Design a protein around this ligand. Structure first.
Ligand SMILES: C[N+]1(CCCC(=O)O)CCCC1
Ligand SMILES: C[N+]1(CCCC(=O)O)CCCC1
Ligand SMILES: O=C(O)CNC(=O)C(=O)O
Ligand SMILES: O=C(O)CNC(=O)C(=O)O
Ligand SMILES: NCCCCCCN
Ligand SMILES: NCCCCCCN
Ligand SMILES: [Zn+2]
Ligand SMILES: [Zn+2]
Ligand SMILES: [Zn+2]
Ligand SMILES: [Zn+2]
Ligand SMILES: [Zn+2]
Ligand SMILES: [Zn+2]
Ligand SMILES: [Zn+2]
Ligand SMILES: [Zn+2]
Lengths: 385, 385
């Protein structure tokens, strides 16, 4: 009844098609959009699922010349004698009502979000299961999207495990630090991460204009002298900052900060960027945090009178992250892998002691959110069918 | 005189340092920023050129406790007895005056832009020269940035040339179509590009939220039956659209359009995105065009009353691109490579005839603008030294 056609007709100077469905709901489809989306082989390349029709071929003032219909299809003639068929179910899905469009957007983009603080129960799956079973890889990526982090247990204590996860998604995101990289204390370290020091809360790689969406960290070797992990939900922290100090939130969400990274690793590099630390979409919702205090430049491209208030705002933001209500602390053991949303979470680690042999070793990599979402879309289809 | 210190002193409750330079110009440096940027080994990891100092260690209300200076250095004591030295030239570069900050930003980001229409003289360099000589690779990337396109002549007529250019920059940007991809007519084509049809003006890969910054196309085989190239300067076209039809510009710069790509190539994929076709920065300047009519979805996430005006705006934009004042047409020969700014230019090709053997073959690849800019920064330093 919902997707069965009861009536179809051209309205409003034939510039609109109205479908009355058998449940008595009505849907409206502009004629220009119908013409633009003709599925015939002249207009649409089925092997590619892509539009061949050019904007140049489209009369934006077009109207329907003739229309007949049955319960499952509409058949339209156009003014220039072009001919189109549209399926009822295809039409129903693309209904222009707010409810129908929002339902479809949810299906495409998985927007459901669960914010957390120190009460987090770390979602945990088995590593080999995720590699082997679509049901498990689906739970992995969907939970990664919703919660921002999933721990995988039972990997080996050898390099190469993040690369398996990379292939499971599709491919890893290459950067100047390599396809994968080794987190260990290094002589003449080219990054603060490659020392035994504390890492305060940061996102990785704000020196890029498109920071990595998803980060993978696999514990090969752990030390008993420190090196615990800490994470925080930046979207949760931002919400609290907006509530507690709207001025601080306004400053961090509007001030461009310069980031830098110069050195040599997989290739030689001299990287510069600008980001707002709290990055809002066109509706004022936080979509990304861009903040690593190590790679924030000495160069600061603001008028002098804005400098101290910026630092005061930043300090408030960091104090919120460190609060016992926000922060979640845990320790990785050999064989553990954490996979997390590097646009949403901030992460850190406690200092540990240096010595003459390597006491601590993580292997890490990145993936692009679009690559992850693609896999998530495919998995959902496989597991629901 | 300009970078020699005549006087240094703490002002405004000791919350500011003022430098009077020997040319009588004055510079102001907030004390919090000085403390934040202490170059000592406790605060700053020289091997990484990175800040070790935590936000947590920074007193945002700090003032200078004591200061002495000579012509080339300032020496500061802080309230907690921490001690800092700053070099005159380092200070001068980071002066908070608008002029000094703007000069430095120009140096970091190469913003100079030369807009063009049908009068374009295609910048052209030799392929092997660019691989061999820093002076030539510098001209290549700087011209790529400024003009949006450079042609390279004298490459081979074999696969593998774009990969050499990839290594020259640093590395190529992997996508679902491969590290490199072959533009040829293909049975069961997964993309309109892989047919003999016309490609109207488009940017590549708006189905990704971070479309490729730079595109490389190398002509291996060309056909005499058509297959000419066309390019247009989207930033130039956008400027003209804003002048001729502000309503059309407002619509295209504010309406989110859904893009899609589903299929199988280097991996299996189901990719979805949303973009404004004309993407403005926070100041209203165009920073990216996101438009491929083939991969624009049938799904269109707008209220019905916004649909036809969107199409009317799009048609006006495309008509401007096609105008004889805007468009530049040329034909690639075997051995030619074009490298262009895929965020700024739109490109297309004329249809050609199918047949039983491959009559036309391009190899293409992408690179990230941050990767290109990094190389550009390094080259400039090498060639100026
Ligand atoms: C790629 N690595 C992180 C980049 C963090 C940052 O420089 O923002 C380099 C050090 C370990 C992982
Ligand atoms: C990577 N390729 C372009 C993508 C153009 C697009 O699908 O937006 C796939 C066809 C040839 C190059
Ligand atoms: O070493 C750790 O526990 C965490 N490392 C990082 O956050 C990093 O390398 O960027
Ligand atoms: O084939 C050409 O001349 C141009 N090709 C494309 O724009 C493409 O493959 O995306
Ligand atoms: N069942 C309706 C079929 C209409 C076909 C029209 C061909 N021009
Ligand atoms: N030339 C000035 C050197 C000052 C050194 C001070 C050490 N605390
Ligand atoms: Zn149905
Ligand atoms: Zn058709
Ligand atoms: Zn990190
Ligand atoms: Zn290299
Ligand atoms: Zn000097
Ligand atoms: Zn110091
Ligand atoms: Zn293209
Ligand atoms: Zn694959």
């Amino acid at each position: 009844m919902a997707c069965t056609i009861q009536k179809a007709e051209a309205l409003d100077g034939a510039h609109l098609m109205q479908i009355l469905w058998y449940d008595e709901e009505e849907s409206l489809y502009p004629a220009v959009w119908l013409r633009d989306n003709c599925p015939c082989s002249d207009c649409y390349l089925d092997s590619a699922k892509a539009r061949k029709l050019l904007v140049e071929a489209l009369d934006v003032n077009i109207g329907i010349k003739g229309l007949i219909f049955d319960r499952k299809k509409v058949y339209i003639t156009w003014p220039d004698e072009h001919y189109s068929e549209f399926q009822a179910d295809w039409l129903k899905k693309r209904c222009f009502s707010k409810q129908a469009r929002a339902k479809l957007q949810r299906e495409l983009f998985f927007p459901e979000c669960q914010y957390w603080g120190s009460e987090l129960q770390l979602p945990t799956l088995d590593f080999e299961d995720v590699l082997r079973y679509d049901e498990h890889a689906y739970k992995w990526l969907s939970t990664l999207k919703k919660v921002g982090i999933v721990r995988l247990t039972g990997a080996s204590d050898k390099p190469g495990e993040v690369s398996k996860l990379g292939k499971r998604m599709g491919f890893l995101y290459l950067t100047f630090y390599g396809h994968t990289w080794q987190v260990q204390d290094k002589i003449d370290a080219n990054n603060v991460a490659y020392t035994t020091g504390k890492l305060s809360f940061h996102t990785d790689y704000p020196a890029l204009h498109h920071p990595p969406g998803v980060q993978l960290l696999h514990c090969i070797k752990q030390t008993v002298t420190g090196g615990d992990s800490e994470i925080v939900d930046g979207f949760n922290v931002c919400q609290k900052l907006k509530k507690n100090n709207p001025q601080a939130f306004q400053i961090l969400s509007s001030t461009f900060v310069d980031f830098t990274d110069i050195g040599v690793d997989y290739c030689d590099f001299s990287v510069q960027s600008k980001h707002k630390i709290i990055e809002l979409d066109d509706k004022g919702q936080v979509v990304r945090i861009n903040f690593n205090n190590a790679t924030r430049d000495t160069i600061f491209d603001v008028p002098v009178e804005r400098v101290q208030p910026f630092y005061a705002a930043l300090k408030e933001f960091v104090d919120l992250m460190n609060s016992k209500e926000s922060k979640f602390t845990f320790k990785m053991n050999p064989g553990d892998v954490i996979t997390f949303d590097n646009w949403r979470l901030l992460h850190g680690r406690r200092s540990y002691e240096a010595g003459t042999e390597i006491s601590r070793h993580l292997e890490g990599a990145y993936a692009d959110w679009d690559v992850v979402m693609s896999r998530l879309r495919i998995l959902r289809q496989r597991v629901e069918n």
